[PDB]
């Protein structure tokens, strides 16, 4: 087997990456894309050494693989420790879609999320925001984008509290149950949310302003053809199946002023104007805002 | 020796599974039948290796078997990881039977669940939905079909919340008390439910629309001969014992318009009509809908 | 010597048992008596193996016994898995005794439960139902008969919920507080209940019909001599102790039509008549019904 | 060395005792004295074996000693299981002292409890019932006698329910919070209650008769001398000291009819007569009743 | 053989630290800056030893490094023991910023915390206070400044209890979950807090006075231009963002009397007056107070 | 071999200690000072053994050190068993201080605690009692004096329960998390408590008298000059500092009647008179009382 040459190559890779990491850890952690790439490369080298050890029974290969796993673990631990000491995080981009039941919010949100995660980085991931009745985050791995379906189904005050905690630039600790997950932090870039409620928070809620100002895009949706069909021919499934289109052109979307809390233009401070929009335009605006915030956080 | 022959066979099988996983993973997880076959093959190879190891004590044999077990576990973990990060799931098929007490709903539900599980896949398995007194999902193993009896017995609103959560195409994390089951999800293909309440949810409930649209087949059951005999010959066990047939002829079934909530054909949006049905026709329709949805999920 | 032949016999027993299990696991689990007998034989084998291992001291016997107990545990685990995969259980036989205070319902119920447990299976056990202030089932082990000493004392509607849950053929999950007890279900064959209330449920309760149909035998008890003795000469302990009898002749028993809720013969659907009865006749009838149900559940 | 010979001796005793447990499980679990002595000897043997193990240095003797320890552990577990499988328990002897404040019934109750505990078994323990504030029983240790001070106090419905639960011959399970405390029985033999209430339960309580029948000795206590001293010489400490006596002769006690609930001799069924008594007659009668019940249960 | 020479130098440094520690543990404990520098040097040396051990593979270097780290751990444990027995600590300096939402409290607080952490020590760190949903302090590493964002968002009274416990000179033990972190204490020097509430505690609170006196600098903030722009042009993101400045000139700050609880000058024991302040005046005053307290504690 | 001679001398000293303890178990277990001195001597022997092991590690020397540490462990286990088997242990002296907020109670309490610990024994330690947020005692080391601050801040009921449990003369077992700590006894001579609430318990507490009787010294504090200044100059911090003297002469201390619950002299048994006191006078009286209590416990 060509074990010696691959071992030498991975040795060179790990040593050069070790020195590179040791150089400027502070700027590296403030550079999100570079750090993510470095972690991915470390994982690739680790799994490659693991499989190389697995397929060979030579004790020398096993010892070398153990040494390389030791080195890679040390580097990953040092970088993770530097990242935990940070005192700020980027402010995530939050999109919240409100509309009647059965019109297509969930599948549109899935499309938006995948497009965004691809745009931020090739190989980006989508994660799940645990909902009420689950109080820990042990399924979380720090993905680029997060999905939150049925926000406000029941217990909307707790939904507001979670949203205020995570939609911010101040660091945050997350409750976990497993021993090795204690002391985890929320470091995702974007959040997409679907709800049936009339807004982010109730109009009599104490923290109305704090939660409303944290939503970057607040979209209100309808679908006239779906609703008309369901109204005139109840129980007919083929017609309704015909009312939906593969480019989401059945959804009619309006956008509210940044910081609003209903579909009439009211914000906690003044009155603005609603404006029509589509799903491509929303994707373009969201991508632009994400890149802008990323650049300004790098320059911070 | 036959032992080394079986060892070579299982080595070839694990090599085939490894190369299949390495080639493509997203297309494999998007193909539910192929992924399940993959899992079955890996489980059978693991069990055969374990029993063969137990039947002997040769150091070389145990070493080879432990290495093979490690490789099998690695492949299984990789597939599990790929499935955990899916952004969508197939929408389950949900049947809810309402009717007066004592007439035979639970038996019909078990018949339907067995046949459905076998038709979806040879060796289907049916599982249990925890009821309102149990708040954790330990004891769920990703079953093809799930059975849920006494829906709305005391706490119909928590049952409504649970049903809305699980019946969807949005991935979901379940609450479990063991550490090793932490952050697991719901991946079932159908749910069969029996009820004594007038419908899926109260007419004054807030999430009436969201809950009703998620019910695929709403069946209303009666049994006139049984009710007559237990009315005119109370306390007589034998006359009542004689009113049940081994093919469910005693049950008389009506089907409501998809999205309704009562006997008279009312829906949240319109006013449709009822339709007489039988248990076998209902089964054929459920199989047809399950196949349609599975093909669409594989394509999308 | 004795150890060699004993371990050879144990090996033969375990191998033939493994063959039988592999052959007809499903038949066994559907055949209650055979499954119970095989489980008891496995318990005997494990106990004998551990005793023999402890008695002697040398590597050969200890290693052989360890392997044997491991294989026995694997067989028991596979059988338990198959038993947990079932879609149905046998409907338990339920007896409820209602009468005025201080006449001897508890002693009679213990007599009945002991006789029933002995008849269902030589060496059967009797367990306890967590009454009302304990919400967990961590003492439950899967006994033949269950004893419910007070029912409806302080919260009768919660008692009705629990009785509806456990008196069924649908598989059930039990709430437990220990880690190793998570995902436990109810498999007992008979339930004897003593009460101080008018009937199984309040007359205006909402689930009267569901809970009253599930009581096989509803007995109303009295003791005219005891009541006369304590009404004419209050405070006399000697006369009271004189009143009772070792053969339970002091109790007079009436039987209501099945599905009734009071002692006037009323049922939720009709109106029957009351019958006289005794403890021995009750025991004979209950054994007959239990064997009938066991045979019919097995023959499927 | 000598460690051989001694081992033989001690181990023989172990197995010897095992024999008298194997053939007499019913008797040992029936009578508390024999089982208590058996446990005492078993733990003495375990301590002796630990001492020998720490003293000894031969691998063979420590192997034998740990084998003996395992044998002791399994025997103790068997005894515990047989005890936990009981379908009945001995009925407690319950004394209730009804009297106004500032007469000295708490010290009298402690004296009675101590003498009873010594009589029932030498060097017995005395425990405290949870004080209507903790709903769990974590401190409980199965004491011979239980003392309940200030029964009632505006929370007498819950106290009535608790007394009905514990004063019985049916097995009971207690609510706890610790993992190892789950599923705990009740095993005490006598209860002494002191209260200011006018009886065991309110005259309108639903469970009046059931609660009244379980009280063995209901004694109404009065101290005319102390109340006279308070009337004549308020704030006089020397007179306060003078009124009390070391022999409790200052307490005037009326014994109520068996099963009564009032100081006028009223009973839920008839009318009786109050009698005069004292501390020593009460203690003698309690001891006699306890011995009667204990032997009756032992032979059954 | 430079590795041996550097290892000998490290050993000499370890011996120097060992002899230094024995000088006076009590005074070194009293001197916080010296203790922090000593621990920093110790951990840096140990990390260097471990890294150079990882670089090499010969037994000699690893053995020498194990001995050196054993000495290092001995010293670290001795100093930890000395530091754990103290009966007093120093009072942290507490800054609390109160103002309307969205004006820049969190970013100003981050600025202040960074500057103050560097001012206290060259290279000091900032850490995160656990919030109401997280229950354990496993992310705490004894950092020199602490951040607390969103104080009193949901449960203000629990926040008051926590702040009263941590702002004090009495030693405090912190709840945690990992075993090795059982029994660690709070040792930070400064705390920076932001809130939307109108003061440290609600006026009707039982512990108003105890909590108010523990806050050293209470600042009330307002940004009139930001409020004007967001009121006149609701939804104009660029116009609003043009109002924020890199020198925090947009935010106007008034300092309240030591011990006050609102912005009208009121104190629990009287009424004072408000004064104007800025970022740099706050920073200089906080540094002066911190240095004063550190010196006074040193002398004590 | 000087190492062998030193090890033999240490072993002979250990054996002498064992024989002295065995022949004088009662005195060692009773006299607190004797037990502390014995523990310190054993700790010194352990330190010498560890130093000897560092000096040499020959296999014979290793075995000798193993035997020495085994002897020391035997001594520790014997002492622990004797103390656990002890019927009772000396009860501590409680000094509770109450007063307005921010007058200097914590610093005075620390001063008094240090002085007491030094008086009772040279090099006497001081410990911190866990507060409400912590429920485990893993940081307890059997200190001479315990210090408790902010008693009754949030959990006055649970604080009262802990005060009743802790001052009792019966043996008490402490909760702990780590496996070794499990089985931890409480042994300490004095408890100094600083409070903001009036009196040890509220006037309506059912166990008011029982918890008051556990308090030996009850001090009420007032600092009239500090209060007047902070009333007249709310914001002047230097003026506030001017009022505190390094001899604690700014405090005014009153002492309440034995058993009292408030500062007006009222007692459960009547009423009394307050007295002036000072910190040194209180210290001398407390030392006298603790010495008398220890003497009477030892003499028996
Ligand atoms: N783009 C689409 N292509 C095909 N079918 C669609 C599409 N969008 C919606 N549907 C159909 O409409 C159903 C509604 O799906 P969802 O997107 O979950 O609706 P919804 O708006 O989330 O409803 P709520 O508010 O959660 S009750 C789907 O299950 C499909 O049957
Ligand atoms: N197909 C059948 N064959 C034989 N007996 C039957 C059949 N269906 C019902 N029964 C009998 O009728 C009883 C009715 O029980 P279930 O089937 O559980 O009725 P149900 O509709 O679930 O009533 P509820 O709503 O749960 S009270 C059964 O327990 C059997 O004794
Ligand atoms: N078979 C019997 N032999 C001897 N004494 C008996 C017998 N049956 C009842 N007794 C006596 O009568 C009492 C009645 O006790 P229980 O059996 O508990 O009566 P009960 O019907 O359960 O009353 P409730 O409803 O539980 S308050 C017993 O405690 C005995 O003293
Ligand atoms: N025989 C006695 N010997 C010595 N002191 C006694 C005696 N009887 C009463 N006393 C005193 O009387 C006091 C009254 O206290 P308790 O005995 O608790 O009164 P009590 O009857 O319990 O009041 P209640 O009903 O619980 S409020 C005791 O604390 C003793 O000091
Ligand atoms: N100094 C600044 N430099 C640049 N942008 C700023 C600055 N201050 C505020 N902003 C912007 O305004 C937003 C206000 O954020 P925060 O500082 O978190 O406000 P806030 O005072 O904490 O509001 P609350 O109380 O948390 S609702 C920031 O997220 C930035 O987008
Ligand atoms: N002897 C002293 N010398 C110097 N400053 C003192 C002295 N006593 C008190 N002070 C100051 O006054 C403050 C009062 O704090 P504490 O000693 O904690 O008072 P306190 O009695 O504990 O108040 P509470 O009840 O905890 S709110 C201290 O933090 C010091 O700043
Ligand atoms: Mg949706
Ligand atoms: Mg049913
Ligand atoms: Mg009873
Ligand atoms: Mg009393
Ligand atoms: Mg903020
Ligand atoms: Mg204080």
Numbering used by the authors:
A (entry chain C), B (entry chain D), C (entry chain E), D (entry chain F), E (entry chain B), F (entry chain A): 64 to 363
How is this structure described in the published paper?
SF3 helicases typically assemble into hexameric rings and couple ATP hydrolysis to conformational changes that generate mechanical force on nucleic acid substrates. Through integrative modeling, we propose that NS3 functions as a transmembrane RNA translocase, coupling membrane-associated genome replication to RNA transport.
In hex-NS3, the NTD (residues 1-61), is replaced by the 32-residue cc-hex coiled-coil sequence. The resulting structure shows that six copies of NS3 assemble into a funnel-shaped hexamer approximately 80 Å in height. The HBD and AAA+ ATPase domain form upper and lower tiers measuring ∼70 Å and ∼105 Å in diameter, respectively. The six subunits form a right-handed spiral with a rise of ∼1.5 Å per protomer and a gap of ∼6.5 Å between the topmost and bottommost subunits. In our NS3 cryo-EM reconstruction, clear density corresponding to ATPγS is visible in all six nucleotide-binding sites, although it is less well resolved in protomer F, which lies at the seam of the hexamer ([Fig fig3]). In five of the six sites, resolved to ∼2 Å, we observed hexavalent coordination of a Mg²⁺ ion by the β- and γ-phosphates, the side chain of T169, and three water molecules. Subunits A–E show the γ-phosphate interacting with R276 and R277 (arginine finger), as well as with N259 (motif C), supporting their classification as ATP-bound. In contrast, subunit F adopts an apo-like conformation, as the arginine finger is displaced across the seam and does not engage the bound nucleotide ([Fig fig3]).
